[PDB]
Design an enzyme around this catalytic site. Structure first.
Site, PDB file in Angstrom:
ATOM      1  N   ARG A  72       0.809  -1.211   0.000  1.00 35.69           N
ATOM      2  CA  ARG A  72       0.000   0.000   0.000  1.00 35.69           C
ATOM      3  C   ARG A  72       0.840   1.257   0.000  1.00 35.69           C
ATOM      4  O   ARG A  72       0.305   2.356   0.169  1.00 35.69           O
ATOM      5  CB  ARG A  72      -0.956   0.022   1.182  1.00 35.69           C
ATOM      6  N   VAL A  73       2.144   1.110  -0.178  1.00 37.74           N
ATOM      7  CA  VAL A  73       3.082   2.204  -0.067  1.00 37.74           C
ATOM      8  C   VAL A  73       3.387   2.689  -1.475  1.00 37.74           C
ATOM      9  O   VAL A  73       3.501   3.887  -1.733  1.00 37.74           O
ATOM     10  CB  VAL A  73       4.358   1.793   0.694  1.00 37.74           C
TER      11      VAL A  73
END
Lengths: 74, 118, 73, 117, 69, 284, 73
Positions: free
Chosen positions: C9-10
């Site tokens: 999710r980065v």
């Protein structure tokens, strides 16, 4: 031949104990040096009768709700 | 026990059980009410005894006989479920009724390929 | 590693801008390969336009394979 | 221990190729079950035939199983087994039937068994 | 061709000629010297083929079913 | 396992079985239409073969290259194949029969040349490496003769120009609605006729303009018709082979439903008991 | 009696030596005969000796069939 009978109407203690009585009769011939043959006409009902006795005594069941003992039973 | 009173008189009796699966299911409900531990699929631990105590009284005797016709219901169409599996141990014959045979206008609509008797 | 079922999710915020630039075409090539994967069991029934995507996605999948204890700069 | 530094590169590559084609055969089995084999590619049929020949060549008779079957037990050295699996994988034994590989020792026994069918 | 009490006209289905037929043979030769192939018009087969190809993909039905084979 | 994962796969196999049933129905209709179109093609070849037999083997037998067995040094095959899959083993049976007969020929050291109808044969023979020299593909449901003209022309030109010394067609014969057989048959030099036209003694044609050029045209058209017939028979063999193959696939799906439903029943029973046992044993 | 799944872990030592020598390995032969007749369903292809093998396996399976209460010495 000896016939040992524990019918479907009879108490579960009689059903699961019945094969051990039959083995106790076969074992006499065995220990006297003779030959005997024994047929246990459904171990899979002995197991169900023993499961009934074990669940009535509130013992924790395992896989397929059978007791942990059942392998030692057979 | 009414069929048994007819038997003692020396007659041949027919006993119809309109759904034995509901006899099993009411035994399950009563077992749960009494607080006993659940068996293989939630059924009562005394299932195969409660079934045998009924089905063993339906026998021929050297005074008379009771024959029985029992409507059976298979949960989720599973012939392995403990209730069908316990009932089929006792059945001697098996009659299957099919809607296809009835659409053909054939009555009784007994399916002769699946109907079975030992 | 099973791509597309696997998530971070980065995203690119944790990548050098060269990697961030180059990775988008890898993602789209494998997404197209995954969509066109089903036809692979009937490859020579297919059209050449989709065939060029199918055999490109195989070459990317083959390129990701890597031996243990050989970190790459 | 199945690492190239411990076992050596040839063993490691033979074992990985056996795993790879047996996995590809597993992936084919569901489509072979529905459609049947005829639909496969002429590449796919070759890896199926080799995977089935590998599955047969993995079998071996045992000196202790010499009472369940009458076959004499066989002892196969590491060199002979990698030599045979490397031979099968690259197609040099493509002409023998599958039954030539069932319950044999080294590959030179499979080439003999093929003659007797 | 005409016969006693009978006649037949073995009609051609397309115009025939030394040049037209040589042009068709030239294209048939070119298409083989290259590896260019066309697409069948069976859109029904295409639909059913692609529906079956998606439906049969990654069932995992074997190993799930303990069928050995 | 997992009860939901299995039920999802049961649904996906049922959907596959339904698709295959529809494909069986479609093929069983296309087969009838194709095998009627097959019968619509006989009169042309039959009446032309009676004419050729009168000109070639009757009285005043004319001489032509196609009629006579010049020595053979290289051989030509017209190969018919499908543009489509799911037909079962049909094309591979035919191509393996060809490669066997072509290998027997090449034992004697003769060369062989191929012309292809249909995309499957092109793909297979290029993978094998055969010497394909002309092709037509994408015939679909609608095989025209005006598209056969091309490759037949190449093989006829190569014959009269003296390169090819024998010409074959390779095709599946439709025999029964569930029985088809791969065959190789000789086109040129013209097969011997069984019949003798000695009973045509009583008459002869008024040949306008001249018999020899007319026999040349007759033979060229006849070879074309015999190739078109071999294409339409192979197409009806394709529809029947697809029908049978989709029938078998539908029965395989129906068996796999049984095996998956047994596994699903076991899974859902085990889930019920493992949950209710956790609940009951958790209550001290 | 389903071959292949059924076994005797005591094996030939139980048998009279005539029966041991005559019956040899046939259960494993039927294990493969059953699996192969199941796999090779389309046709009897590769007829090297399969017409003998499968006719023998049919002939034997037909021979093993027996009516109850008729014991053979």
């Amino acid at each position: 031949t000896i016939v040992v009978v524990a019918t479907a109407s009879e108490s579960a203690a009689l059903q699961y104990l019945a094969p051990y009585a039959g083995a106790a009769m076969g074992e006499y011939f065995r220990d006297r040096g003779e030959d005997a043959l024994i047929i246990y006409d459904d171990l899979s009902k002995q197991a169900v009768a023993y499961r009934q006795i074990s669940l009535l005594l509130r013992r924790p069941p395992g896989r397929e709700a059978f007791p942990g003992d059942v392998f030692y039973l057979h | 026990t009414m069929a048994e009173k007819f038997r003692d008189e020396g007659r041949d009796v027919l006993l119809f059980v309109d759904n034995i699966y509901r006899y099993t299911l009411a035994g399950t409900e009563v077992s749960a009410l009494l607080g006993r531990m659940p068996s293989a699929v939630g059924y009562q631990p005394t299932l195969a005894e409660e079934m045998g105590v009924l089905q063993e009284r339906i026998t021929s005797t050297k005074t008379g006989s009771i024959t029985s016709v029992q409507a059976v219901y298979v949960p989720a169409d599973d012939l392995t479920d403990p209730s069908p599996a316990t009932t089929f141990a006792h059945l001697d014959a098996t009659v299957v009724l099919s809607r296809q045979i009835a659409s053909l206008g054939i009555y009784p609509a007994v399916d002769p390929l699946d109907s079975t008797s030992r | 590693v099973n791509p597309g079922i696997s998530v971070s999710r980065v995203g690119g915020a944790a990548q050098t801008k060269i990697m961030k630039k180059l990775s988008g075409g890898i993602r789209t090539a494998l997404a197209q390969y995954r969509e066109l994967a089903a036809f692979s069991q009937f490859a020579s029934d297919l059209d050449d336009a989709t065939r060029k995507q199918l055999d490109h996605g195989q070459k990317v999948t083959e390129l990701l394979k890597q031996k243990q204890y050989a970190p790459m700069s | 221990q199945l690492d190239p530094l411990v076992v050596g590169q040839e063993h490691y590559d033979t074992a990985r190729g056996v795993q790879s084609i047996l996995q590809r055969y597993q992936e084919l089995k569901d489509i072979i079950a529905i459609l049947g084999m005829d639909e496969l590619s002429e590449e796919d049929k070759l890896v199926v035939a080799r995977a089935r020949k590998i599955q047969r060549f993995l079998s071996q008779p045992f000196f202790v199983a010499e009472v369940f079957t009458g076959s004499p037990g066989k002892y196969v050295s590491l060199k002979d087994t990698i030599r045979g699996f490397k031979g099968i994988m690259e197609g040099e034994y493509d002409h023998l039937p599958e039954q030539a590989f069932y319950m044999v020792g080294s590959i030179e026994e499979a080439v003999e068994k093929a003659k007797k069918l | 061709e005409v016969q006693p009490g009978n006649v037949t006209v073995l009609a051609d289905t397309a115009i025939r000629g030394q040049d037209l037929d040589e042009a068709r043979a030239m294209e048939a030769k070119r298409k083989a010297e290259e590896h260019i192939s066309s697409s069948h018009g069976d859109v029904d087969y295409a639909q059913a083929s692609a529906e079956l190809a998606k439906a049969i993909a990654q069932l995992r039905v074997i190993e799930l079913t303990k069928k050995a084979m | 396992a997992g009860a939901k994962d299995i039920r999802s796969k049961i649904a996906s196999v049922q959907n596959t079985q339904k698709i295959t049933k529809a494909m069986e129905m479609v093929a069983a209709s296309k087969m009838r239409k194709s095998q009627d179109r097959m019968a619509a093609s006989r009169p042309y070849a039959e009446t032309m073969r009676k004419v050729i037999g009168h000109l070639a083997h009757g009285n005043l037998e004319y001489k032509h290259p196609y009629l006579e067995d010049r020595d053979v040094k290289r051989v030509g095959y017209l190969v018919v194949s499908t543009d489509r899959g799911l037909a079962g083993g049909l094309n591979i049976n035919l191509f393996k029969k060809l490669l066997a007969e072509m290998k027997t020929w090449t034992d004697k050291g003769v060369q062989a040349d191929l012309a292809m109808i249909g995309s499957k044969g092109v793909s297979f023979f290029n993978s094998v490496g055969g010497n394909v020299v002309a092709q037509v593909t994408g015939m679909g449901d609608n095989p025209s003769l005006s598209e056969l003209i091309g490759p037949v022309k190449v093989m006829l030109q190569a014959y009269d120009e003296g390169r090819l010394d024998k010409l074959y067609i390779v095709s599946n014969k439709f025999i029964n609605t569930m029985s088809q057989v791969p065959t190789i048959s000789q086109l040129l030099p013209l097969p011997a006729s069984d019949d003798d036209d000695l009973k045509h003694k009583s008459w002869d044609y008024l040949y306008e303009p001249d018999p020899k050029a007319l026999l040349d045209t007759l033979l060229r058209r006849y070879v074309e018709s015999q190739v078109y017939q071999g294409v339409v028979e192979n197409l009806a063999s394709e529809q029947a082979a697809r029908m049978v193959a989709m029938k078998a696939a539908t029965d395989n799906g129906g068996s796999l439903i049984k095996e998956l439903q047994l596994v699903y029943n076991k899974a859902r029973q085990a889930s019920i008991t493992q949950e209710l046992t956790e609940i009951v044993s958790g209550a001290a």
